[PDB]
């Protein structure tokens, strides 16, 4: 049964300590950097957060432990300072919004709660990014949608129409992924890891961060290149890298609230592995996707005559790669997932599944 399976996974992982190596060592050719104005942007973000209609205790906790201006500064280390505010605001939106509709959220176990939120959020995305935009939040707009209107307005002001179409669809995909994960018909067992992994790859909200590199660095990747098999592969590999490293780095946080649909725990449940063995297998898949991604670079349609085109290809894939390294680097520099005292002087993370 579901209850028996959960009971057993908690038993086998309870109070375990796992020493996790520095994940950035597994992507050594992909460097991490920090946008040089993060602190000054955070001063602006703190003033802006006063105007956001999200509960004060929630805003303070996200700001302190999440600190998403830092995440934007690692994803987009070479952007001009003027781009940082919108990029940082967007991350505050998506983490605030996800908080209400993720596995522990207010809306997650209510049919109308999820469905009506997704309807309102999809309408905002359409209102701001479609061909007849209206950026004014409707009078009844809830706080986590009202704040999205000016953010999308500002991002669209720095994006071409081609990049805007990608951002729009990627956001709908994220919102619809949330809506479609709510099943009227719940299964009496933990999911097969393959089914869970497929769901995460389709529904993770990170592809909008790749497209926002086109805002950050003020360029447009042409669709005919974006649809090339090697570029599709690079996007997919970096998406998978980000999901897998996030499964490891979020294991402690998720286990402590008994949220057991974590890929590491599903490996334990389905393949009869210890938690150490399961993390080791995830790290092995990380190494694989890093190598697959690098191999795809040689197949890209590089130009022999158009260096501006080549520069856009190079920046687009560096944005993809910084999604993977940046999510890891940020996780090692904030307290969303664990206390930073849990890192030692060799950047090894001592996870502690006590509760």
Q: What distance in Å separates the CA atoms of residue 323 and residue 238, rounded to the nearest whole number? A: 7
- Strand partners of residue 352: 17
Q: How many CA atoms lie within 13 A of 180 on its CB side?
A: 11
Q: What distance in Å separates the CA atoms of residue 47 and residue 85, rounded to the nearest whole number? A: 11
Between helices 263-271 and 2-13, what is the axis angle to 10°?
100
The number of beta carbons lying within 10 Å of the beta carbon of residue 54 is 20
**Rounded to the nearest 5°, which phi and psi values hold at 227?**
-90, 0
Cα torsion through 197, 201, 202, 208, rounded to 10? 150
Residue 32 marked in a binding site = no
Q: What distance in Å separates the CA atoms of residue 240 and residue 227, rounded to the nearest whole number? A: 18
The number of beta carbons lying within 10 Å of the beta carbon of residue 50 is 8
Q: What distance in Å separates the CA atoms of residue 83 and residue 37, rounded to the nearest whole number? A: 11
Closest by CA to 271, choosing from 193, 209, 354, 159, is: 193
User: What's the reported resolution, in angstroms, to a tenth?
Assistant: 1.8
Does domain 2-353 fall under CATH 1.10.600.10? My reply is yes
DSSP letter string, 185-209: S--SSPPPHHHHHHHHHHH-TTHHH
Residue 98 marked in a binding site = yes
Residue 246 marked in a binding site = yes
Closest by CA to 300, choosing from 287, 288, 314, 289, is: 314
Residue 337 marked in a binding site = yes
- What determination technique applies here? X-ray
Q: What distance in Å separates the CA atoms of residue 23 and residue 333, rounded to the nearest whole number? A: 13
Q: Is the dihedral of CA 339, 318, 166, 162 positive or negative?
A: positive
Residue given tokens 């201006």 in the structure block: 69
Classified as helix, coil or strand, 135 is: coil
The number of beta carbons lying within 10 Å of the beta carbon of residue 109 is 11
Q: What distance in Å separates the CA atoms of residue 323 and residue 80, rounded to the nearest whole number? A: 18
Q: What distance in Å separates the CA atoms of residue 301 and residue 66, rounded to the nearest whole number? A: 38
Q: Is the dihedral of CA 186, 187, 190, 195 positive or negative?
A: negative
Q: What distance in Å separates the CA atoms of residue 32 and residue 267, rounded to the nearest whole number? A: 30
Q: What distance in Å separates the CA atoms of residue 191 and residue 189, rounded to the nearest whole number? A: 6
Classified as helix, coil or strand, 66 is: helix
Q: What distance in Å separates the CA atoms of residue 203 and residue 179, rounded to the nearest whole number? A: 10
Residue 135 marked in a binding site = no
């Amino acid at each position: 049964t579901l209850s028996g399976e959960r009971r057993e996974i908690i038993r086998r992982a309870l109070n375990k300590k796992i020493l996790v190596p520095n994940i950035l060592e597994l992507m050594p050719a992909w460097p991490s950097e920090f946008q040089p104005n993060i602190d000054e942007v955070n001063v602006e973000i703190d003033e802006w957060l006063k105007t956001v209609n999200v509960a004060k205790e929630k805003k303070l906790k996200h700001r302190a432990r999440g600190n998403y201006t830092l995440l934007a500064g690692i994803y987009y280390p070479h952007c001009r300072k003027e781009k940082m505010l919108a990029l940082s605001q967007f991350l505050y939106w998506i983490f605030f919004w996800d908080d209400e509709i993720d596995t522990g959220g207010e809306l997650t176990e209510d049919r109308e709660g999820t469905i009506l939120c997704c309807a309102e959020t999809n309408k905002c995305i359409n209102d701001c990014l479609g061909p007849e935009p209206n950026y004014t939040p409707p009078p009844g707009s809830r706080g986590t949608v009202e704040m999205l209107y000016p953010i999308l307005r500002d991002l669209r002001a720095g994006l071409s129409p081609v990049s805007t179409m990608r951002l729009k669809q990627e956001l709908h995909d994220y919102v619809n992924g949330v809506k479609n994960q709510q099943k009227v018909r719940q299964e009496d067992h933990l999911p097969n890891p393959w089914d869970h992994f497929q769901m995460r790859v389709d529904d993770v909200g990170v592809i909008p961060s790749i497209t926002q590199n086109e805002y950050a660095m003020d360029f447009t990747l042409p669709d005919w290149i974006r649809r090339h098999e090697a570029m599709e592969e690079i996007v997919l590999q970096c998406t998978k890298l980000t999901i897998l490293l996030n499964e490891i780095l979020s294991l402690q946080k998720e286990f402590r609230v008994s949220q057991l649909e974590n890929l590491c725990l599903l490996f334990m449940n389905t393949y009869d592995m210890s938690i150490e063995q399961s993390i080791h297998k995830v790290l092995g898949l990380l190494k694989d996707h890093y190598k697959i991604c690098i191999e795809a670079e040689a197949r890209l349609p590089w130009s022999t005559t158009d260096e501006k085109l080549n520069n856009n290809i190079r920046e687009y894939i560096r944005g993809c790669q910084r999604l993977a390294t940046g999510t890891a680097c940020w996780s090692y520099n904030c307290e969303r997932y664990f206390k930073l005292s849990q890192l030692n002087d060799q950047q090894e993370l001592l996870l502690d599944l006590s509760r």
